[PDB]
Amino acid sequence: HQNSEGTGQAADLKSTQAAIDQINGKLNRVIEKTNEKFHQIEKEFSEVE
Amino acid sequence: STATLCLGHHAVPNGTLVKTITDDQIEVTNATELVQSSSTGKICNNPHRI
Numbered sequence: 001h002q003n004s005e006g007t008g009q010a011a012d013l014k015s016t017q018a019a020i021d022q023i024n025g026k027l028n029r030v031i032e033k034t035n036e037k038f039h040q041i042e043k044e045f046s047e048v049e
Numbered sequence: 050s051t052a053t054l055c056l057g058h059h060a061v062p063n064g065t066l067v068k069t070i071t072d073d074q075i076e077v078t079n080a081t082e083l084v085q086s087s088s089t090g091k092i093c094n095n096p097h098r099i
């Protein structure tokens with residue numbers, strides 16, 4: 001604000017919060033926090049087959 | 050001497066939740082299952098000759 005009393009600044013927590021909420025949760029949603037796998041296929045060899 | 054005109058949308062008693070990008074969970078006015086989970090338990094002989 002730039003009133004006759006001078007200048008001043010104030011952040012609106014409401015608006016700011018809405019953005020943060022949407023941002024935070026998204027990442028984990030899109031990608032699965034984790035997935036397990038154990039015995040698989042040899043992804044390497046030393047000779048020709 | 051004045052009139053008020055407004056716009057708006059519909060609503061339902063109890064909506065359903067859905068997974069969206071922006072919001073982790075939000076309710077809509079209608080949903081639908083995209084994953085077949087039930088099963089008759091019987092093999093239908095047609096069309097494929099079984």
Ligand SMILES: *[C@@H]1O[C@H](CO)[C@@H](O[C@@H]2O[C@H](CO)[C@@H](O[C@@H]3O[C@H](CO)[C@@H](O)[C@H](O)[C@@H]3O)[C@H](O)[C@H]2NC(C)=O)[C@H](O)[C@H]1NC(C)=O
Nearest residue numbers: 059060061062063064065066077078079080081082083084
């Ligand atoms: C949600 O809103 C939708 C749309 O207003 C409604 O569901 C839809 O209901 C119609 C008719 O019951 C379904 O269409 C049907 O398609 C078959 C295709 O084989 C056809 O044989 C029928 O003659 C009819 O046209 C449509 O699939 C369905 N869509 C969905 C899944 O929403 C309904 O009013 C509300 N609740 C439901 C059922 O989701």
